[PDB]
Design a protein around this ligand. Structure first.
Ligand SMILES: [Mg+2]
Ligand SMILES: [Mg+2]
Ligand SMILES: [Mg+2]
Ligand SMILES: [Mg+2]
Ligand SMILES: [Mg+2]
Ligand SMILES: [Mg+2]
Ligand SMILES: [Mg+2]
Ligand SMILES: [Mg+2]
Ligand SMILES: [Mg+2]
Ligand SMILES: [Mg+2]
Length: 190
RNA sequence: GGCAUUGCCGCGAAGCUACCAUCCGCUGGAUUAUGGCUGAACGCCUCUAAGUCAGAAUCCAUGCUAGAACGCGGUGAUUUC
């Protein structure tokens, strides 16, 4: 319909420096730093008062101003990931064969190996994305916690660890076996 | 020794040859289908719209064959008593 001017509202908390050049966003907070390259969107960022940044689309169609809230959510995810962090908790689900998941070291690359998935002799290796740290929960049975600054890195590494444990040639409604995301949340949240 | 249009029989080196004999037949990337991540549109949801992950005997390379006789390069020597 070619909307005149659409606005979204990125709120910047304390301790967080959101420095935006052309369309390269750099968010520095207590937990670290994150950099996004939003050069594929055609939006305009304006800082209001050091706690608020507007992002705007001028003369945008429906598919263009659909990407404005995506951009606002992406920079909000950067801000949330460098303030509170991100923490995805996965559970191992098996029927008979226990899934033995360890973290292994292969010429300095930090894989997660999965052995005995449905009695396979195949060792399923999932590399750990940089920024993502892996721990295995004590006092919660069969839980792996992937945490980091980037929701994209953390959630894609969790998705990789899930997708490596897919069941082939079987009814997957009965063979419900794998590693699944049971929780998405933050590191220091209350 | 000759001739029998290589006279015939047995063995027969060399050469040629046989899945009738042996040897050899490479591994990276990009993808489709599909399953996903982040995520709006549509305050929710959503693999999709922006962005992105994995992935077929596919595709393109690595490898292999020919080398443009009007594609190119490096280098040697370049004529007399
Ligand atoms: Mg069957
Ligand atoms: Mg005669
Ligand atoms: Mg004779
Ligand atoms: Mg043959
Ligand atoms: Mg989602
Ligand atoms: Mg797709
Ligand atoms: Mg797309
Ligand atoms: Mg890929
Ligand atoms: Mg290669
Ligand atoms: Mg030639």
């Amino acid at each position: 319909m070619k909307y005149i001017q659409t606005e979204q509202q990125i709120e910047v908390p304390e301790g967080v420096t959101v420095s935006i050049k052309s369309r390269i966003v750099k968010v520095v907070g207590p937990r670290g730093t994150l950099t996004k390259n939003l050069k594929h969107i055609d939006v305009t960022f304006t800082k209001v008062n050091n706690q608020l940044i507007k992002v705007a689309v001028h003369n945008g169609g429906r598919k263009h101003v659909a990407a404005l809230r995506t951009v606002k959510s992406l920079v909000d995810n950067m801000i949330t990931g460098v303030t509170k962090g991100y923490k995805y908790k996965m559970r191992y689900v098996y029927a008979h064969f226990p899934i033995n998941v360890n973290i292994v070291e292969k010429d300095g690359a930090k894989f997660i190996e999965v052995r005995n998935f449905l009695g396979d002799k195949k060792i399923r290796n999932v590399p750990v994305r940089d920024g993502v740290t892996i721990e295995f929960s004590t006092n919660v049975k069969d839980e792996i916690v992937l945490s980091g600054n980037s929701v994209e890195d953390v959630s894609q590494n969790a998705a990789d660890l899930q997708q490596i444990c897919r069941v082939r040639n079987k009814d997957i409604r009965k063979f419900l076996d794998g590693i699944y995301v049971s929780h998405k949340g933050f590191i220091t949240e209350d």
